[PDB]
Ligand SMILES: Cc1cc2nc3c(=O)[nH]c(=O)nc-3n(C[C@H](O)[C@H](O)[C@H](O)COP(=O)(O)OP(=O)(O)OC[C@H]3O[C@@H](n4cnc5c(N)ncnc54)[C@H](O)[C@@H]3O)c2cc1C
Ligand SMILES: Cc1cc2nc3c(=O)[nH]c(=O)nc-3n(C[C@H](O)[C@H](O)[C@H](O)COP(=O)(O)OP(=O)(O)OC[C@H]3O[C@@H](n4cnc5c(N)ncnc54)[C@H](O)[C@@H]3O)c2cc1C
Ligand SMILES: [Ca+2]
């Protein structure tokens with residue numbers, strides 16, 4: 001896994017914990033939805049972690065949306081980077097959370113918690129290989145309204161897609177006009193998410209991508225399996241769900 | 248002003264300085280765009296200030312979007328209210344920043360700084376008397392992206408308006424994907440706002456509503472007069488610009 005040297009060109013601090021890095025690095029071409037590994041030297045040793053590309057692959061402004069994990073090894077050090085700093089970038093991207101691995105369906109649902117919205121933003125900004133889906137639905141769940149860092153881009157995407165892309169934000173406990181409140185699995189189970197979006201999530205019409213918090217991913221997959229007869233998708237055994245856990 | 252007792256039902260703290268109150272109170276009917284006055288007793292005397300309704304006239308959740316003016320007489324005390332607390336509400340709404348005072352035109356531009364987005368949210372949520380406008384453009388200018396409190400609602404509105412409504416964010420003090428950087432008058436003058444929105448601002452096609460900071464309001468009015476032969480609108484001298492300053 002050889003690497004190249006990236007240079008930080010922008011640091012955007014969204015909240016005390018959330019930031020986006022913009023980096024220029026001579027990486028190889030990647031597929032929208034894939035991740036690389038970013039690395040710094042910590043206590044005399046190379047430390048690296050996976051981070052998804054937020055940018056479309058044809059945009060050389062590499063962008064990563066991160067949360068500072070308390071007591072985390074690498075994230076606080078990435079949080080300390082300034083424009084002009086170097087960071088190590090693995091030159092070939094990894095991952096199967098990509099349209100190439102998503103079967104045709106009427107409605108493609110894309111569920112993310114927190115910083116796990118990245119891969120959907122890469123995919124949606126790139127805008128290729130989506131003609132075969134009638135509907136696209138992006139659901140961003142975060143703890144507070146203040147944590148929904150890509151709403152302006154989301155307004156841009158919604159307009160671009162002319163009604164084909166439907167977007168819904170979810171917050172944990174706040175009452176926020178325009179957002180749903182609560183857990184993604186609970187909002188699926190009680191019908192509120194589907195009512196808000198105005199499209200069903202079911203085996204006949206949907207594929208569901210799930211990205212980020214393992215509890216959200218696990219609980220949602222268990223719910224859809226037990227209550228909607230929806231299965232994990234495999235090349236050899238076609239199904240309805242594609243997942244990428246962030247931990 | 249004849250008043251009623253409101254009960255705070257919800258308080259949403261957006262930022263250290265921004266908050267929205269929700270109130271139940273037996274007010275008289277109001278026109279979307281109008282304001283009332285909210286009041287508290289401070290050192291033995293009744294103090295009150297004007298606040299625009301954010302809610303549509305048929306929504307009993309009376310909602311006000313406020314900035315805490317540091318050491319302001321009333322706003323810090325309103326920021327201290329908690330659900331269940333009482334607040335004084337004037338029962339007859341005031342103001343002429345309403346669609347019945349807006350002349351027919353092709354594109355209605357709604358410009359607001361900071362908390363002055365309220366009257367537009369009332370108008371757009373009620374969604375009446377807008378058939379007559381081919382285009383609606385809502386420009387929310389704030390200092391930082393963290394200050395754009397109603398983006399989830401704006402995204403909801405943009406979706407339901409099926410392309411009629413265009414939402415544009417402007418942030419003066421940083422660069423955020425999907426936002427325009429700068430101040431409203433400069434961005435009108437240099438074509439950026441019109442470029443970002445995708446529609447012209449001119450005397451043939453436009454009416455412009457302006458709400459909030461008096462410097463934004465007067466600088467913009469002066470620019471459009473000198474530069475685009477657009478004038479302040481009156482019943483007796485029909486023109487292109489409607490204004491409401493917040494101080
Ligand atoms: C494919 C993939 C893509 C990813 N993309 C991103 C991304 O784009 N942006 C991003 O911020 N992170 C992303 N992550 C997670 C990232 O790789 C790191 O795990 C994260 O930055 C924490 O690393 P650390 O060195 O600071 O903490 P560590 O010292 O490694 O401690 C991490 C421990 O905390 C946990 N952890 C990881 N993330 C969180 C979290 N948010 N909350 C609570 N615990 C957590 C796990 O339990 C882990 O064992 C991704 C992970 C994977 C597997
Ligand atoms: C018709 C009308 C509608 C209004 N609607 C709202 C609204 O919906 N939400 C809202 O937050 N304010 C609104 N305002 C302002 C509001 O009436 C008060 O002036 C404000 O809350 C500050 O009062 P205070 O007692 O805390 O400050 P004071 O002790 O009276 O000091 C006043 C100073 O506060 C500053 N200020 C006043 N209003 C604002 C503002 N909104 N943003 C930034 N600085 C300000 C000015 O610099 C002013 O000189 C509106 C004003 C008018 C005239
Ligand atoms: Ca009229």
Ligand SMILES: [Mg+2]
Nearest residue numbers: 195196197198
């Ligand atoms: Mg809806």
Ligand SMILES: [Mg+2]
Nearest residue numbers: 442443444445
């Ligand atoms: Mg645009």
